[PDB]
Amino acid sequence: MASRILLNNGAKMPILGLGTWKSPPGQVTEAVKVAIDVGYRHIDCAHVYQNENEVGVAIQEKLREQVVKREELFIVSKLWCTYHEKGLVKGACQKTLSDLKLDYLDLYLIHWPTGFKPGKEFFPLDESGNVVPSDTNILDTWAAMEELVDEGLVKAIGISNFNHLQVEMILNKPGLKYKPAVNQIECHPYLTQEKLIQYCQSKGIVVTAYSPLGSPDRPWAKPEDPSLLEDPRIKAIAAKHNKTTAQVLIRFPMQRNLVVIPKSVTPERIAENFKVFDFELSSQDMTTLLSYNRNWRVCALLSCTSHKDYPFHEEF
Numbered sequence: 001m002a003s004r005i006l007l008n009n010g011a012k013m014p015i016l017g018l019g020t021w022k023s024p025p026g027q028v029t030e031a032v033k034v035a036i037d038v039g040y041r042h043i044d045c046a047h048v049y050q051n052e053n054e055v056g057v058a059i060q061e062k063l064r065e066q067v068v069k070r071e072e073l074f075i076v077s078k079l080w081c082t083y084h085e086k087g088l089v090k091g092a093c094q095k096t097l098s099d100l101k102l103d104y105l106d107l108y109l110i111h112w113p114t115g116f117k118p119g120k121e122f123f124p125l126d127e128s129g130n131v132v133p134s135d136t137n138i139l140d141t142w143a144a145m146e147e148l149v150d151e152g153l154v155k156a157i158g159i160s161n162f163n164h165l166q167v168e169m170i171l172n173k174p175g176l177k178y179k180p181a182v183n184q185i186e187c188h189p190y191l192t193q194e195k196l197i198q199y200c201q202s203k204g205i206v207v208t209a210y211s212p213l214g215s216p217d218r219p220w221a222k223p224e225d226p227s228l229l230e231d232p233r234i235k236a237i238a239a240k241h242n243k244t245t246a247q248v249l250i251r252f253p254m255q256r257n258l259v260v261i262p263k264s265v266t267p268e269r270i271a272e273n274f275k276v277f278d279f280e281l282s283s284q285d286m287t288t289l290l291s292y293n294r295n296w297r298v299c300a301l302l303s304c305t306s307h308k309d310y311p312f313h314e315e316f
């Protein structure tokens with residue numbers, strides 16, 4: 001299987017990338033350096049992760065060392081919810097560019113479909129704990145994203161955590177100039193996303209699977225939640241292939257024509273996670289993994305559920 005997938009902007013995107021949410025700032029520079037040294041060419045970032053400066057130090061060092069050329073890297077970031085307004089989008093993108101020490105992003109995503117009140121706080125709340133919306137909508141935010149392409153700040157634009165109706169709304173936007181290249185969504189054997197993936201793929205939108213290992217380090221994890229890495233059924237498939245459970249969990253979305261972005265700051269795991277191009281899951285393996293779906297989400301948040309554009313009320 002080829003290492004990159006063709007986007008609807010004409011550029012190629014590496015199907016494996018390194019995730020950076022929760023990567024501590026004192027560890028992520030080494031994580032990204034190691035990743036690039038062992039072959040990663042795609043890094044998934046976001047302003048809200050609070051570690052783009054440190055990710056950028058690694059990228060810049062590897063470019064300066066001539067370990068890789070800029071054209072060989074595929075750097076992704078995301079517009080946070082408190083920057084959905086017309087007059088804030090460019091500055092948000094530029095802050096990310098400055099922190100990453102880049103003059104363009106390969107892909108810039110609307111991180112969530114919901115706009116929040118601008119200000120210092122990433123999750124502005126009212127006194128009862130509900131997020132405070134902005135009156136921005138996904139269509140006007142999209143027009144602002146299109147401007148970034150036309151200004152040379154980003155090579156591609158896309159969306160993240162958009163449900164099928166929200167994707168459809170973007171595709172049906174009056175005067176749409178650039179289609180979204182990517183929809184980045186949670187996807188793993190407990191949340192298989194067949195409906196949303198088929199819709200996006202049918203429209204030429206590439207899907208990126210986040211939390212492919214079930215995000216065991218998510219800060220709201222409960223001791224009782226289901227665990228992909230410990231699931232004996234997945235362990236069995238891994239054993240049959242002489243691979244680790246994580247390697248199976250990474251290969252799974254790859255064979256569905258998805259991009260996948262496992263996170264690690266552990267050098268041995270960063271390397272392990274990249275060794276997924278030399279085996280194949282059978283169709284039966286794939287269908288068996290799909291059968292484990294239970295519609296379980298890592299990524300959901302009660303404080304945001306009443307926002308008009310919160311994505312997870314719809315079935316898909």
Ligand SMILES: NC(=O)c1ccc[n+]([C@@H]2O[C@H](COP(=O)([O-])OP(=O)(O)OC[C@H]3O[C@@H](n4cnc5c(N)ncnc54)[C@H](OP(=O)(O)O)[C@@H]3O)[C@@H](O)[C@H]2O)c1
Pocket residue numbers: 018019020021022044045111160161184185209210211212213214215216217218229244246247261262263264265266269270272273298299
């Ligand atoms: N667009 C969005 O809204 C959104 C939401 C969630 C995630 N994402 C992106 O997707 C990325 C991945 O998702 P995620 O961070 O939620 O979780 P994940 O990649 O599913 O899991 C990360 C966890 O798995 C561990 N791990 C990694 N490789 C392992 C291995 N080979 N064996 C055992 N454990 C392993 C990591 O530990 P160590 O790091 O300690 O090694 C970490 O605790 C994020 O970092 C972010 O870039 C985007």
Ligand SMILES: O=C(O)COc1cc(Cl)ccc1C(=O)NCc1ccc(I)cc1F
Pocket residue numbers: 021046048049050112113114299300301304310
């Ligand atoms: O959103 C992400 O990329 C990962 O999740 C988070 C990352 C950070 Cl730095 C802070 C918070 C979250 C988090 O609560 N995500 C869940 C979530 C956020 C926003 C909305 I709108 C809905 C959600 F489910």
